[PDB]
Ligand binder design. Sequence first.
Ligand SMILES: O=C([O-])C(=O)[O-]
Ligand SMILES: O=C([O-])C(=O)[O-]
Ligand SMILES: [Fe+3]
Ligand SMILES: [Fe+3]
Length: 688
Amino acid sequence: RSVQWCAVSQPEATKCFQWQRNMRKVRGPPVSCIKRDSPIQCIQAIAENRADAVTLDGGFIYEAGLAPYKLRPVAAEVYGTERQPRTHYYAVAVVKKGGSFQLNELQGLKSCHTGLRRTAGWNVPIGTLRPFLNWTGPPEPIEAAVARFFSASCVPGADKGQFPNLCRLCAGTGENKCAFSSQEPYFSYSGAFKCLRDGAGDVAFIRESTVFEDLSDEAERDEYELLCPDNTRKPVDKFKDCHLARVPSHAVVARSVNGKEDAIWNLLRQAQEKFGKDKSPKFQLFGSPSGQKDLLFKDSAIGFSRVPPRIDSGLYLGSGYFTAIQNLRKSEEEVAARRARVVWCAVGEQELRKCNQWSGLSEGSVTCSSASTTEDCIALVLKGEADAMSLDGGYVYTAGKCGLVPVLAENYKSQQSSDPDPNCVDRPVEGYLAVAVVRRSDTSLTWNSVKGKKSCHTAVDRTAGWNIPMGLLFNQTGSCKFDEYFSQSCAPGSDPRSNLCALCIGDEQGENKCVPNSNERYYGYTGAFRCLAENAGDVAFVKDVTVLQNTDGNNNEAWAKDLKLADFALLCLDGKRKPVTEARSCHLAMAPNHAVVSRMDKVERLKQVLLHQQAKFGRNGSDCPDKFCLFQSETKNLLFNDNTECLARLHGKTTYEKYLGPQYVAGITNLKKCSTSPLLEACEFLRK
Ligand SMILES: O=C([O-])C(=O)[O-]
Ligand SMILES: O=C([O-])C(=O)[O-]
Ligand SMILES: [Fe+3]
Ligand SMILES: [Fe+3]
């Protein structure tokens, strides 16, 4: 079956045709070409299946990610060199030398841009100069404000109608003037450079390549330089050192659903290899005829790179640049309100309910967001759509790999440095005892003979219930087969078809079996524990407070009502057995305290909001419990552990690595080797 590319022009359809001819020629996968007049029409061809793929600028991957279309990028242009190739470029501000104005002195000058809504020609620069625009906000389109900032401009695609100034130096003819296409001489990255070049403009907003690509001679290059963001002028090659922004390369988007990703990927791979960088005159994928530029793909791209399926437009774009486009549409106050506000990610209904309820008492400082899985919560923090949540030392690793960092850690009752403690915030964290619990009665179960029995775990990927156990057991056999370790388990967030989920029970309705959220009755600390207590598994991987807090009337949920501590025992690594109260000398390992994680941009504020909220809804805080307890769900441990004495200062461990430790870090790494999350795969891709 053939893969239908969408051409947004004549000369692009043409190429696509020559592209066509040499694939079937050369025996390769087939490509059918479509014609349309523009990205949006190309974006609508795709979603009502009238074409399969189209390559697009950052500004449009965005557009394309919106309902009703909702396309997703599947391959990224790679730029640079085979040696040092990249999936990002630099939005630079280029001027001719002789003059001296810096990025702040642009008001009134004439500017040349790539087109309306394009990373480097609109989105980046206008976002950089907002502060000078004196933009009142909606309903007055920013355009209105930029058209008043510069004297004359060329902003292909702007409304000549409403924004005359914006089209003033456009060089096209009649209806071609100021068009979002090749009819307009000053369009895309080379137009905009020609504009500066021809003296129409004063500044051209383009990518770092444009002058070396369009400008043959080095010494010709010497007539231009870059406006750095530090109000300094540096040479055209110090891009790395002087750029407005660093951004995501263009990408082939395609339908999320019935994408035909395979094919696209396969056609690109092949086409890549056959007609890629000087591999076949017979036809060139990244070269356009003389007079033309960037047909289909970006002249001088060096290939394509797959985009890991966890990624959408929003995560493809990056927190920074994604929210930045959003912002071209909100007053300065609404943007500022969003920043003072801490959006919390809630995992499930229950956690969502409590979050709300806090929301109401935060006095607008805390609002709620939600997901049905932790990882889906780390993905919203990344799209800047949520901002914080408390994670197990297991998710601080993933998050860490993703760029998020530990802000504050939950603090639990001490090494008995004691007292109901006044200086907990400054009190250094102590870790928690990851233990292995079994019923007193199974006198013959030991560390050494647990293997093969049925286990109960909090969820896959957490310290206590997965990483510590599974890890002690993996050292010994090197078996990546974590599902043969125990006969049938309850390890939420595993294949509900697999063994790992055989004893899980979903909800009160036998629904949600083996899901990583509170809906599963056997999920988390308390849930792994009750999986034992109802003799579903034989060993549970929890912490010791779990047994204490859930036995001896400590828990008055029927399941737990009659259990007494004396019926439980902990398995020592030594082959011994011990009473729960002896966990200090009888535990598998010491786990690091859950930590609240956030993007780096939001740390100080988060600090604040949380240090203030705990004064009021904390353990020994004000409105608690007349009004609300932040740290009480009652054994559900929603949003935080019910045993958090407080939220304490980091003491410099403020990188998932300093925080977690060489050891712990080493360990997850090994285990993740057997397989990694689609989510860790995605972040790997956006990191490099
Ligand atoms: O990034 C840009 O400015 C473009 O693609 O025109
Ligand atoms: O450590 C664990 O298993 C947890 O925090 O759920
Ligand atoms: Fe671009
Ligand atoms: Fe934990």
